[PDB]
Design a protein around this ligand. Structure first.
Ligand SMILES: O=C(Nc1nc2ccccc2s1)c1cccc2c1CN(c1ccc(-c3cnn(Cc4ccncc4)c3)c(C(=O)O)n1)CC2
Length: 139
């Protein structure tokens, strides 16, 4: 969806700027997701397997290789915290890509995240009250 594409670009731009990199609507959802991603990274991430160690992105990486790694994140179903983890993971892949002088990968990871949201997460998001419900719970 257009709104999910906008949330992805917003979150990735926020994370790249936060990590010392140049980063060239639904304001309440964007702010709640930016803050939840920060809280996820500070307080919950280290408990889980580091998914960046399973996906080494290069200009030869296919969407379906990213899809398989992200499927591990949702192995036991979807919840708001695992969706935040997903955005945080995309953020980390972007920062790594810019670090290794592979700027082309930032827009590819953004497209991959939008595809993954469309294919696997949007039905759950709608069923669970939409991004407006995410804001009531975590905003
Ligand atoms: O995420 C993973 N690895 C990553 N590596 C990197 C590397 C770089 C950057 C980012 C990442 S993420 C991972 C890997 C393998 C398996 C699994 C996970 C994540 N899991 C999670 C993730 C969050 C919650 C949860 C649920 N609620 N919360 C709290 C809340 C809610 C809203 N916002 C923030 C925190 C938190 C739960 C859970 O308990 O169900 N499980 C599910 C199983």
């Amino acid at each position: 969806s257009q709104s999910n594409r906008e949330l992805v670009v917003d979150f990735l731009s926020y994370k790249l700027s936060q990590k010392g990199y140049s980063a060239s609507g639904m304001a309440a959802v964007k702010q709640a997701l930016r803050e939840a991603g920060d809280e996820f990274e500070l307080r919950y991430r280290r408990a889980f397997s580091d998914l960046t160690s399973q996906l080494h992105i290069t200009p030869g990486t296919a969407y379906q290789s990213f899809e398989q790694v992200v499927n591990e994140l949702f192995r036991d179903g979807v919840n708001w915290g695992r969706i935040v983890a997903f955005f945080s993971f995309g953020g980390a892949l972007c920062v790594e890509s810019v670090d290794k002088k592979m700027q082309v990968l930032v827009s590819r990871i953004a497209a991959w995240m939008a595809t993954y949201l469309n294919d696997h997460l949007e039905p759950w998001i709608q069923e669970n009250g939409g991004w407006a419900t995410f804001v009531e719970l975590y905003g």
